[PDB]
Amino acid sequence: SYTGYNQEDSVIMNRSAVDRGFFRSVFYRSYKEQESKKGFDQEEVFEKP
Amino acid sequence: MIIPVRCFTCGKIVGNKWEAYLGLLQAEYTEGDALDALGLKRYCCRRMLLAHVDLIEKLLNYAP
Amino acid sequence: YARPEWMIVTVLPVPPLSVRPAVVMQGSARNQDDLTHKLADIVKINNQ
Amino acid sequence: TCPNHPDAILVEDYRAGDMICPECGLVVGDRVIDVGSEWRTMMNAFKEITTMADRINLPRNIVDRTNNLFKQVYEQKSLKGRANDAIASACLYIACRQEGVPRTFKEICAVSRISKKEIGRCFKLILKALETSVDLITTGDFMSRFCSNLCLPKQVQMAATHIARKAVELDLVPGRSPISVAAAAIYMASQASAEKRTQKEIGDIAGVADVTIRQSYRLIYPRAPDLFPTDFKFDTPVDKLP
Amino acid sequence: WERDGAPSPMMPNEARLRNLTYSAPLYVDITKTVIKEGEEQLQTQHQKT
Amino acid sequence: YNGFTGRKITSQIFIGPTYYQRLKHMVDDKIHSRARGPIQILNRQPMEG
Amino acid sequence: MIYICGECHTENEIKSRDPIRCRECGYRIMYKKRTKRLVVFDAR
Amino acid sequence: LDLAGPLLAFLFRGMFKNLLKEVRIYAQKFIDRGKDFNLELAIKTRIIS
Ligand SMILES: [Zn+2]
Ligand SMILES: [Zn+2]
Ligand SMILES: [Zn+2]
């Protein structure tokens, strides 16, 4: 019980260890988009407006 | 994936000991003997090499 | 406030556009609410 | 519609979904933009069209184009008298041709239930009704499929592609259908290379009578070497071919 | 099957990348026999249907 | 020893290497606020935008 | 507008209109090339 | 425990029965019409796929 910040199932982490890569992780989010020509009137394409 | 540069606990350099550590193990050193040969006295630094998994080796088996 | 004759639907009310809005899907193709489709059916039979 | 700024281009805002005066800040419309919805952040024929397309494994986009064409000609009704399967087959052929992966009528009659004659008739009728056109087929269109249906390698495939393109270039085959020229070129590049194929197998795949393969192979028979690719490995001398 | 209709082996990664279904074609040998009450029997087999 | 003062802690602390795991649940993935946001057109009530 | 083939890793300039496909490989999975713009990382 | 196999075998028979039912319906139309039927056209491949 160091300073009361680990009470009730909480944890005190070393900031210096975190600075060194301790439990550093990557998060990858993948986004998929498809262009559909269904419908003669509407024809969506990829291009910067 | 790759050996950390610093020991998390104390900041000691560990990134230049993985290759030597593997070489020492190939020389029939016990894991503890190899760590002592490498100057890793604190068990926080011994933890770094004793528990390291070098996934970068298998990641290089995939062609870029 | 209430009469037995009023129970019979002689004139049918039409909900406002706020109650049933014109949703927009696939561009400018206005998607009418389910009420409009029933309202379209009601008026067609009523005229017939 | 800023009351202070008549005819002002209000700026859409995604924070609350309101349009704000471009230079006032006044919010015109409380939360009317509906940000979430706006910014992304007759039958038995479509059944039949999909039934046909599955027999060829052609991708769904071609089937969507096919269904669009079918709907269009079912509104024109300038060919109402035609059977619906016939219109479906002709639309499938026109879509395959429009996408740029054309098949032959014999590759649609092989799937549909109607004769190639009716497919061609309704195809012309549809091109006439829709007032559209389709680009002319070339010999390089039937090669990625003919050489792959055959077990030929990619080397023999590019070989036959080059032979056929040069042959139609050098006018060795005047007025002959691109499919027969494709079959002849594939036969040449096959007999020249490691995996040999007879006229029969190429006739089955391409849908060309072996007599036509012979006739359009004798037209490119004497000019064999200058058609082939220069850098071309083989185990049967291109200087000797049947 | 590509757009042109050329078959090619489908690798599991390509199925994952291109959002394909890792499916194998299924074929069945079908034997058809027809009798026309004319003391003749015609038996035709469609291999790998 | 106390990091802030350097004085020995009267109790001797149980300390050693333990295998810990970082869980997928990050606070950034969870923190979210709403303040006069994009209500629905039909219901005139809050919705995500 | 350079796209790297997923099979042979061939860099080929591809227009928006023309179909996406390896010029020589024929492969149909293409990866965009890394941006030429410079992005700063603090080694923290 | 119904693993992938037995679970898949449960689907296949239902889907194969539909396939056999479908060819029966397709053939019956042509047989009644008086004309023989094409086996390849009678099979609906989308039923199993
Ligand atoms: Zn250490
Ligand atoms: Zn203003
Ligand atoms: Zn490639």
UniProtKB/Swiss-Prot annotation, chain D:
Acetylated. Autoacetylated; autoacetylation at Lys-166 stimulates transcription activation. The keyword Transport does not apply. It catalyses: L-lysyl-[protein] + acetyl-CoA = N(6)-acetyl-L-lysyl-[protein] + CoA + H(+). Keywords: Acetylation, Acyltransferase, Chromosome, DNA-binding, Host-virus interaction, Metal-binding, Nucleus, Phosphoprotein, Repeat, Transcription, Transcription regulation, Transferase, Zinc, Zinc-finger. GO terms for molecular function: acetyltransferase activity; DNA-binding transcription factor binding; histone acetyltransferase activity; nuclear thyroid hormone receptor binding; promoter-specific chromatin binding; RNA polymerase II complex binding; RNA polymerase II core promoter sequence-specific DNA binding; RNA polymerase II general transcription initiation factor activity. SUPFAM superfamilies: Cyclin-like, Zinc beta-ribbon. Expressed in the inner cell mass forming the embryoblast. Not detected in cells from the outer thin layer trophoblast (at protein level). Residues 172-242 are annotated as: Necessary for TATA box-bound TBP complex formation. PROSITE patterns: TFIIB, ZF_TFIIB. Changing residue 218 to E: Inhibits interaction with RNA polymerase II. Sequence repeats lie at residues 52-128, 146-222. Changing residue 124 to L: Reduces interaction with VP16. Zn(2+) binds at residues 2, 5, 21, 24. DNA binds at residues 40, 80, 82, 117, 124, 176, 200, 209, 212, 214, 218. It comes from the Eukaryota. Its main location: nucleus. GO terms for biological process: DNA-templated transcription initiation; meiotic sister chromatid cohesion; positive regulation of core promoter binding; protein acetylation; RNA polymerase II core complex assembly; RNA polymerase II preinitiation complex assembly; spindle assembly; transcription by RNA polymerase II. Its EC number is 2.3.1.48. Residues 117-121, 177-180, 211-214 are annotated as: Core promoter DNA-binding. Changing residue 214 to E: Inhibits interaction with RNA polymerase II. One of its GO terms (cellular component) is nuclear body. General transcription factor that plays a role in transcription initiation by RNA polymerase II (Pol II). Involved in the pre-initiation complex (PIC) formation and Pol II recruitment at promoter DNA. Together with the TATA box-bound TBP forms the core initiation complex and provides a bridge between TBP and the Pol II-TFIIF complex. Released from the PIC early following the onset of transcription during the initiation and elongation transition and reassociates with TBP during the next transcription cycle. Associates with chromatin to core promoter-specific regions. The TFIIB-type zinc-binding domain is necessary for the interaction and recruitment of RNA polymerase II to the core promoter, the formation of a fully competent pre-initiation complex (PIC) assembly and basal transcription initiation. The C-terminus is necessary and sufficient for interaction with the TATA box-bound TBP complex and for the formation of PIC. Found in a ternary complex with TATA box-bound TBP. Part of a TFIID-containing RNA polymerase II pre-initiation complex (PIC) that is composed of TBP and at least GTF2A1, GTF2A2, GTF2E1, GTF2E2, GTF2F1, GTF2H2, GTF2H3, GTF2H4, GTF2H5, GTF2B, TCEA1, ERCC2, ERCC3, TAF1, TAF2, TAF3, TAF4, TAF5, TAF6, TAF7, TAF8, TAF9, TAF10, TAF11, TAF12 and TAF13. Associates with TFIID-TFIIA (DA complex) to form TFIID-TFIIA-TFIIB (DAB complex), which is then recognized by RNA polymerase II (Pol II). Found in a RNA polymerase II initiation complex. This is Transcription initiation factor IIB. It comes from Homo sapiens. The gene is GTF2B.
